[model samples]
Target chain A: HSYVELKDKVIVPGWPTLMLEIDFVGGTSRNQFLNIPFLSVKEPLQLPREKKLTDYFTIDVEPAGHSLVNIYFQIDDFLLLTLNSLSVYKDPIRKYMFLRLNKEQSKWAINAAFNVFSYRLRNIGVGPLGPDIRSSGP
Target chain B: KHSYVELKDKVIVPGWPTLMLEIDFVGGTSRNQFLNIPFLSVKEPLQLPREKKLTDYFTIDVEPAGHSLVNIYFQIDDFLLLTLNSLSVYKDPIRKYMFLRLNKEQSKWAINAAFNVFSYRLRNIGVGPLGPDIRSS
Candidate 1:
């Protein structure tokens, strides 16, 4: 199986309860690093596209037990959690549901849900933060 | 009346007219009075040390109103003192106005909500000037 570790850091063994990593995109054009897909980019491109992208970071996850766990990242304005696959929250604004598993084990997705996350701050008009650290091991 | 003094970068404000200075000695209950006040002028072209201590001032009055006697004291750059013969006490529109103003000014010291949320820091030191109020119609 093809396992994707964070671009730079190593995915410590006890990482990412479920997903692989969270990739943040803020540049004008659709950068490849951020182009990583979640669900169906071909179908609806689901979720909001335009965001005042600022600090970009990654959250890496690794499988823990046979059962899957869901996680959520909350933003003051909204909330966005991972979607699809085991151990990911679906929405940052609403979706208070469990992370679903699709006939698989040790399988976690990245950027599963778009715009379902809490928004990063604009830092009094400063540009943005450097890329965040991430780790994943399979 | 006592006041609050703060030397910080930011503070939170509930709302205006908040007292930033504190007065220790006041009214007929206390015998202490201001004496030997110090004054240093930045324009005097005198180079002073990095920091120096300053003494406080005091004034007493039973009904501090109608311009009878007003004593407002604070430390800006150096020791200062003032005693106006007559002072008028305006019915403060809001009792908490002073506290609110002080809080608002102090809030600037607290990291902006978004700034803290993102863990980002502002490197700039200077802030922009204020604009005219548009609601003055």
Candidate 2:
């Protein structure tokens, strides 16, 4: 019921969760010995072409059944990058986290690279990482 | 057309990001000279690696000439980590390496915005002459 005045706005956390699916593929075997991206997204994220400045939303990196080590976003716009008022907040619960637009009253278009570090679930010892691991897999 | 990772192999500076972009300057020359904004290629792609320190000195020279400059972008995956307008290049007549130069406005913006980067690594860097300009910013 009570949230601090961030950049002078009554920011509230709500549903509208944007769920991103995480998958692991590519194999490192004796016969099929080849390296591949350690992480991939199963589909395209429908992050709006446009969003209201006051809209608050939540994002979840699936599987929600599992847990996330950490999640961060590298956004394009520099001016918007510094305005921490409309920033991503980690939820105490592992289910999801809330994000908001500008309390700084800055207009910006959001295009970001979502970097999540985690394990492959009961999976261990992936192949050598060759540095070109960033992907928007579909 | 290419993933951001492929671009990093072209990083021109030791401390800058690894992404490299091909920029064509009009009437290429042999001397270390300055070119105006119009001399750069129309759709130039450039990247700046995260600076080693807030006051670190780097001689980021693109060879050919010193005036060559354009919008800087450091991206990974489907996103951009950092983007800056334009930074001029000038060879210090008294020094051995060329340095990236920014105007008074750009200097302030770079310093204020660089620390804001959210990459796994900090993107702290400096512009303008090596002095209180970057130290204060």
Candidate 3:
């Protein structure tokens, strides 16, 4: 019983949700000790087989069940480097990691290092560093 | 093999197996209007009714395209009226083909009949694309 007519139908979810984790290794006590968790993936997930840098996945830190920081990453296939363990030779590995930080997230720095080849994030204000520590990096 | 999420949270017009017709309306006025319809993977000729000899409603023909799935979309003037999503299309196990109908009125649009083979469900749902929050850019 209504003045205007309405149609009913089923709709798909706008964003599929997923949980991810990032681990750091072979860095330092403070830098390598970071083990990030609870990053939510909100964007439409791309096809895994669609080999392209443009078709990558994104995630962000989940504090109080809200996303404040966003990170976009793509696997770079052309760039490869060799990681030596105790000066032992190893095969050259492909697939470079590329990260893009949001404009606002850049304002508040997380001192995880530009050599930061790992995933790490806490709240917007609190992290491995002390409270309100202005990050210094070039 | 699965890869990407099939176009999600968007309107789909079931036209063929594994394919959907996608439609988007740019903007329009009483005198002029703009609509966006993308090229479908499975192409089948459709007849558009003439402007002069037109009724409040019309029907279109759909045929299978060598597959067992159907996906499609259509643009509408009233974008917000009918909120439709979570649309799935599959072959009818018993009937072996899908029976789809589109009825347009002065202020409403309706899907007469659509069968989902996987779920074993037949739906005759109606949709209104021109309510509040109609503009989608």
Candidate 4:
């Protein structure tokens, strides 16, 4: 894998978050990884009021030369424990995935009400392809 | 200090050999956070096609040393191609994050589109274990 730095800052419309882009080549294939800070959520969880408390950020993935580049996520456990909802969508023709999250819908809560357990994936023809399992600790 | 890679003028031609992308950034002062993705196939090399289309959704189980957040963005040229928001966020040490995307228009095409792939090891940068112990499944 090779490394490259993005000189231009890709900012989310209404947030102070910065975006990072990384490119890679694997033998005869190539891949691109784009990253942005989606949320800066507080811990211990909280209840949502009538108005949304947090802001939402978006990221995009486009596989150009390849038809079906596999996608995966490496995330912390705190996210799963406090997540209220997630939304994902994919275009059948263009093969674009549009994922959305609303702060009003998701709230930091300690096993409290107004908290709904949710996860999102937009593609209608999507499913668990396989489980690539590995671990390490000291 | 955080660093990024810019490939604005770069291009990836199809029917060519696969390539590798590496991204390195500096964050935090204490090296305490660890990340483990339990469902990636390291045994098998990714089969790259000369040309392909978006087809399936992939999911995985992740274990981190502390609370954290992740962000992902997809693009084609200067125009933002797709936006995936708030994929993962929280305080638990063990959790799962997923990937899926789509749009209504199908006329999008990139002859020399740039292909980029990157990742990070989030942890306190100083006064600790040093770096994250990333175990790729």
Candidate 5:
């Protein structure tokens, strides 16, 4: 079940893809929730492959009415350079964020453990909504 | 950021890796996460004892949100740990009592040992997600 699904509509057919979904609970009563949040991923996590064809990690964040201003991600110091500095591709019109971990990042990530990769969703009024998730790979 | 008291920053004894481990929050709340293991001292290498050993294996349970948790059986000679669920991990809980304190070290060693049973191209498994089944019926 750890197999990477190559079915992302935005990515190539055969490419190994892992897409993460972010959801915000709490309705009109905005200031009442806690725990940055959990996510709904297309599939469970699958490992990443570096050089071959470029493994792609994508995010689907439907910020409701909130304007998604910025994303701040943090990983282990060891795996920082590549995974943290992932080649980001955000499609303003397409409504998704694509992070390209070519090869270098993959190599370092391939050596890491189940790292706690955290990301902060900074919305204008929402301040910063951040949470930690264990990424299967970089 | 939630109102959880942090025993963080510039903390660690001699010999322990002086790595600044950053904490991650999910929008925010409290994580009273603690390791239910034996005495881990900075004077020695990071590890648990082996008197508690049986069937060993490694696991990476992927939860719904692409959240992956490393499940490992404590072993160098014996592996008595088991991975129950995705976010759920640890040992048998009953007559023997149970649990696991998923380590940062465990995870680092996790991918390697498990990947031994590779598939990105295929490799091998000597002790990958390798666990012995203590089943009868």
Candidate 6:
């Protein structure tokens, strides 16, 4: 009797972290899936390699379908969603999670860590550049 | 010579049948008296280390087929907040975890800051029904 069960994989190192980066729009099978419209994706081109105000930060997704995937991170708008290092299956390719906001209050924990890196990795299009506010604006 | 309004009236309204109205947007409790947090008067105020309570307050339970039961609560400082006596619903609107910074005369009452309502299934409100299935439990 050799039973060792533990499954939850999500890997990604080429897509700049999928959704938050904006890609993988190829249309999936099994009833058509994949549509990360958490407010119309785009606006997280990645910035904050090191700004220094750190309290807690960690984000690394490699989602496939791990239960239909849902990696919603919003620091300025609130919703820093996560279903727990969850995955549909995609190993070590890059999996990390650790976000702790407002822990000790340091400007609302750096505005919830640059709002999880500008609210979606980066894209921002449609009708007046879409997704108003915060172009590092006052 | 057939009137245009009669292009679709079902025999001058003899048995108008095409019913299907069911609304339910339930997501509650995240209170600050319903909200009006102000977020330091904005300009660029929304940053943090990340992760608060996670979930516990957000609802909009409606069951309307023809009347009205729309529950909307946009996530601002994450508040479904509405106040007068108390119609609370607030969620992770940190200014310092909960409250503080209304200075400069200090004024705030019966807070109200959770908007995103579009209600009008059929009455000329332009047919509303988009975002307001509020959730958080």
Taking chain B only, the TM-score of every model is 0.18, 0.18, 0.16, 0.18, 0.20, 0.17
> lDDT per residue, candidate 2, B1-137, as tens digits?
23211122122333222222222233332234322212111112444345533213221212100011112222222112222223212111112211233333222222222112221222233333443343335
lDDT per residue, candidate 6, B1-137, as tens digits?
A: 11101011121111111221112112211333232221111111122224643123222111100000111111223332221002112221222111122211111110111111122121111112331221211
Output the number of the TM-score-best candidate: 5
Give the range where candidate 1 chain B is weakest over 10 consecutive residues by summed lDDT: B61-70
lDDT of 3 at B50: 51
TM-score of each: 0.16, 0.15, 0.16, 0.17, 0.20, 0.17
lDDT score, residue A50, model 6?
66
DockQ, Cα level, model 4: 0.02
For model 2, what is the error of residue B61's alpha carbon versus the real structure, in angstroms, after optimal superposition? Answer: 29
Give the per-residue lDDT of model 1 (tens digit) for A17-118: 211123233322211111111221111112345643332222233333454322232222222332232212232122221222221211222333232222
Superposed Cα deviation of residue B52, candidate 2 (Å): 23
- Per-residue alpha-carbon lDDT of candidate 5 for residues A8-80, written as tens digits (9 for 90 to 100): 1232111122232222332223221111212222233323344221123333222222222222232223322
lDDT of 4 by residue, B17-135 (tens): 22222222232111332222111111112332335322222122111110112222212211111111111111111112222111111000010011111232211112123212222
Model 1 reproduced share of reference interface contacts = 0.00
Q: Give the Cα error of residue A36 in candidate 1, in Å.
A: 12
Q: How many backbone clashes does candidate 6 have?
A: 44
Q: How accurate is candidate 2 locally (lDDT)?
A: 0.22
Model 5 Cα interface RMS deviation (Å): 17.9
Off by over 4 Å in 2: A1-138, B1-5, B14-85, B88-121, B125-137
Stretches of candidate 4 exceeding 4 Å from the true structure: A1-39, A48-138, B6-11, B20-137
- Candidate 2 chain B worst ten-residue window by lDDT: B61-70
lDDT of 2 at A99: 28
